[PDB]
Write an enzyme that holds these catalytic residues in place. Structure first.
Site, PDB file in Angstrom:
ATOM      1  N   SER A 112      37.188  34.855  43.460  1.00 24.93           N
ATOM      2  CA  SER A 112      37.430  34.620  44.879  1.00 24.93           C
ATOM      3  C   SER A 112      36.602  35.525  45.788  1.00 24.93           C
ATOM      4  CB  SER A 112      38.920  34.762  45.207  1.00 24.93           C
ATOM      5  OG  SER A 112      39.370  36.089  44.998  1.00 24.93           O
TER       6      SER A 112
ATOM      7  N   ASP B   9      42.825  32.640  34.415  1.00 26.78           N
ATOM      8  CA  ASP B   9      43.445  33.718  35.176  1.00 26.78           C
ATOM      9  C   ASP B   9      44.941  33.856  34.915  1.00 26.78           C
ATOM     10  OD1 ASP B   9      41.030  34.438  36.369  1.00 26.78           O
ATOM     11  OD2 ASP B   9      41.303  32.993  38.003  1.00 26.78           O
TER      12      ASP B   9
ATOM     13  N   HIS C  35      41.800  46.289  46.497  1.00 31.60           N
ATOM     14  CA  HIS C  35      42.913  46.339  47.438  1.00 31.60           C
ATOM     15  C   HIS C  35      42.687  47.384  48.530  1.00 31.60           C
ATOM     16  CE1 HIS C  35      45.381  43.635  44.947  1.00 31.60           C
ATOM     17  NE2 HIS C  35      44.855  44.279  43.922  1.00 31.60           N
TER      18      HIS C  35
ATOM     19  N   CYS D  55      39.392  42.971  40.894  1.00 33.58           N
ATOM     20  CA  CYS D  55      39.999  41.650  40.998  1.00 33.58           C
ATOM     21  C   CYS D  55      39.281  40.778  42.028  1.00 33.58           C
ATOM     22  CB  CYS D  55      41.480  41.786  41.354  1.00 33.58           C
ATOM     23  SG  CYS D  55      42.455  40.300  41.083  1.00 33.58           S
TER      24      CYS D  55
HETATM   25 ZN   LIG Z   1      43.561  40.879  38.811  1.00 28.33          ZN
END
Ligand SMILES: [Zn+2]
EC number: 2.1.1.14
Length: 737
Positions: free
Chosen positions: A422, A583, A678, A710
């Site tokens: 993503s 995933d 994050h 991620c």
């Molecule tokens: Zn992840």
């Protein structure tokens, strides 16, 4: 004779998430304190009335909160983080702890194995003391509406302390809280309370076995100091540990979960251990959305009644964990909707079960069984799927043999670079198609896909992704085109603070009917010479994120989904996609509470993963991403997956998470997440290289890929581009060979 019915808790949201709007508007400085409290009062009296009209004899009061029920206690008990010590203790301090203001917010953790998050208390030198009359006020308010039916609810001291951080001495912390609870309980009784629900769910967990003696001490204390109270030792989420011992607690009643702790609790009572006590039987599923199996449930209730002095019927856990009501789900097929039960419908169910047990006649009882029966017989729960005996559950060649075949086709550089799938989503405004031709929307999406392909090509990433701009949710995106899946219009459930989710419902047999991700992936591959990865979601995340059927076993459902993923994978491969990624993000939430039950779960997941990925050619490279921190327990299962490459998150530990892979001499490919996605911060070039080299301590460099921790959907574009440029850090370690 007269069987009482109750409930542990109720959602805060309101039918249309007005609760969410109210408090988010307050934080934005768009709602005065007056309107905040009045708004919250409106909701509360509303919920109290619903529960009253449903026929409840003991109505839960105290669980309503403006954010979190643990945070409520922290502030009420004066467990306020040091950094907030100088602030006046009011609603603004309350939200400051939850959200930060100068000072950062307290941390949140998962509420056991649910999708709800509580606010972790931070203990220190400050002595506990009652900072308000939160629960007493709520009680007296409730009395005006429901009278003696009002049942105060609260999280017990032992669970509260165990859920906390900074506690130096467990028993001393617990003991310091006892006087507070005493006054709280004493006031409530003085105001007219009799039954009091005291949540100690820590006693359904493994950690719980350490606190058996504390439980005896704590609750002998309450029995002595507040003799007139009828305490309910309330548990949920699993069976009562050491039931034989805990059953000896000096409380009037025990709250047992017969939905998620059926076997253990049923045998606990067969012993006759609770024959002289009252049981609050959690027989209605409090965290799933299916109408009760009345024949099954009523039969179980008779067995419980015979083994107790008294019985009160309620859901297995607080209704906090399900949506409000199905009444306005008008897009649903009647046979489904009639077999669905959200919070409000469960209140009705619990009442009807009690009246049936008391020998009362009600046409609604058999009508309920009729609707239940209609659902089980529905054509969509009888779909003929692919015969599993003709499905590969292991790939024709072992990892070794595949690595060369794949290397000969791909010719990827050492320490290949790539991303998890993503990219930042700027457009949500476009997705308004409202109405707008599918061709315009697709052209829009494809434009953004091409843009990030060039970006990736200019960053010099070795393996490209399309960005998943078309996906708003990694689960619902798939369930949208899979048989047996449906979405609700208003089925929201609070996850943390004002944030809530609307989980899809898996109501029937899962079956792959049409291409789900093929178009976007193929189009991305048509723009670049570099390999483009396909991204799919696994059974763990799909089942955990969705409300799954309870009429078939976990493994059967898992396998169904596996078959679906296999079918999608076949389409991707036929269309020329040579690297496919599965995933999984919900392993932490999906893993059973009890250690003793975790292997069977992992086993199921491993098998379903084989079903999904064993039918590809040896040249097709299978990747899997797993959001997870601790791999020491499950490294066997991970090796068992036989994934060509598993991408893991190492940045937070500086690659030390590689430890479990080292001890296990993991032979397969590993993708090293070398940047915290994050955080908006852009890592240093040296910070990254050091993160890459750590895992190079023992395992061969030829096994590793380089990638962010991620997906990048949460991040902004500028920081993302800079963060990815990282590739240089990778190129550096490659230089020094
Ligand atoms: Zn992840």
């Amino acid at each position: 004779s007269m069987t009482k019915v109750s409930s542990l808790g109720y959602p805060r949201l309101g039918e249309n998430r007005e609760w969410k709007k109210l408090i988010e508007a307050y934080w934005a400085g768009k709602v005065s304190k007056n309107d905040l409290f009045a708004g919250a009062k409106e909701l509360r009296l509303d919920f109290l009335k619903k529960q009253l009209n449903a026929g409840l004899d003991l109505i839960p009061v105290g669980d309503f909160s403006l954010y979190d029920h643990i945070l409520d206690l922290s502030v009420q008990f004066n467990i306020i983080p040091k950094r907030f010590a100088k602030e006046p203790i009011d609603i603004d301090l309350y939200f400051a702890i939850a959200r930060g203001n100068e000072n950062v917010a307290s941390s949140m953790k998962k509420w056991f194995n649910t999708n709800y998050h509580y606010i972790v208390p931070e203990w220190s030198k400050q002595r506990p003391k009652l900072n308000n009359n939160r629960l007493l006020d709520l009680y007296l308010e409730a009395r005006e509406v429901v009278g003696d039916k009002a049942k105060p609810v609260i999280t017990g001291p032992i669970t509260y302390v165990a859920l906390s951080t900074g506690v130096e001495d467990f028993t001393a912390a617990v003991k310091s809280l006892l006087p507070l609870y005493k006054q709280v309980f004493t006031e409530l009784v003085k105001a007219g309370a009799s039954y009091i629900q005291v949540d100690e769910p820590i006693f359904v967990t493994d950690e719980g076995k350490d606190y058996l003696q504390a439980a005896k001490a704590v609750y002998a204390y309450f029995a002595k100091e507040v003799p007139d109270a009828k305490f309910i030792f309330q548990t949920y989420f699993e069976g009562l540990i050491d039931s034989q011992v805990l059953s000896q607690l000096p409380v009037d009643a025990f709250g047992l979960d017969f939905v998620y702790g059926l076997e253990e609790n049923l045998e606990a009572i067969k012993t006759g251990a609770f024959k002289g006590k009252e049981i609050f039987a959690g027989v209605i599923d409090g965290r799933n959305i299916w109408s009760s199996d009345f024949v099954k449930t009523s039969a179980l209730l008779e067995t419980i009644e015979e083994q107790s002095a008294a019985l009160t019927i309620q859901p297995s856990c607080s209704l906090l964990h399900v949506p409000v009501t199905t009444k306005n789900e008008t897009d649903l097929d009647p046979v489904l909707r009639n077999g669905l039960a959200f919070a409000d419908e469960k209140l009705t169910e619990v009442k009807r079960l009690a009246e049936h047990l008391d020998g009362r006649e009600d046409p609604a009882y058999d009508l309920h069984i009729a609707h239940f029966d209609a659902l089980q017989a529905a054509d969509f729960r009888n779909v003929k799927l692919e015969d599993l005996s003709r499905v590969a559950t292991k790939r024709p060649s072992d990892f070794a043999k595949r690595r060369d075949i794949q290397q000969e086709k791909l010719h990827l550089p050492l320490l290949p670079t790539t991303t998890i799938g993503s990219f930042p989503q700027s457009i949500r405004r476009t997705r308004a198609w409202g109405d707008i031709s599918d061709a315009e929307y697709k052209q829009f999406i494809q434009a953004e896909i091409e843009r990030w392909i060039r970006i990736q090509e200019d960053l010099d990433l070795d393996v490209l992704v399309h960005g998943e701009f078309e996906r708003v949710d990694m689960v619902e995106f798939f369930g949208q085109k899979l048989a047996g899946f449906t979405t609700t219009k208003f089925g929201w459930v609070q996850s943390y603070g004002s944030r809530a989710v609307k989980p899809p419902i898996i109501y029937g047999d899962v079956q792959h009917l049409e291409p789900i991700t093929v178009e976007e992936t193929v189009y991305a591959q048509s723009l670049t010479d570099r390999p483009v990865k396909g991204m799919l979601t696994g059974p763990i995340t799909i089942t955990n994120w969705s409300f799954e059927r309870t009429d078939i076993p976990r493994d059967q459902l898992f396998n169904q989904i596996g078959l679906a993923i296999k079918d999608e994978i076949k389409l991707l491969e036929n269309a020329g996609i040579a690297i496919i990624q599965v995933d999984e993000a919900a392993l932490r939430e999906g893993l059973p509470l009890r250690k003793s039950k975790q292997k069977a779960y992992l086993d199921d997941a491993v098998h379903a993963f084989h079903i999904a990925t064993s039918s590809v050619k040896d040249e097709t490279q299978i990747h899997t991403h797993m959001c997870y921190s601790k791999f020491d327990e499950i490294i066997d299962a991970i090796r068992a997956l036989d994934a060509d490459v598993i991408s893991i998150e190492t940045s937070r530990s500086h690659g030390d998470i590689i430890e479990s892979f080292e001890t296990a001499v993991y032979p397969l490919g590993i993708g090293l997440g070398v940047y915290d996605i994050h955080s908006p911060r852009v890592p240093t070039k040296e910070e990254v290289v050091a993160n890459i080299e750590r895992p190079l301590r023992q395992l061969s460099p030829t096994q590793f890929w380089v990638n962010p921790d991620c997906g990048l959907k949460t991040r902004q574009e500028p920081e993302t581009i800079a963060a990815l440029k990282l590739v240089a850090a990778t190129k550096e370690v490659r230089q020094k060979l």
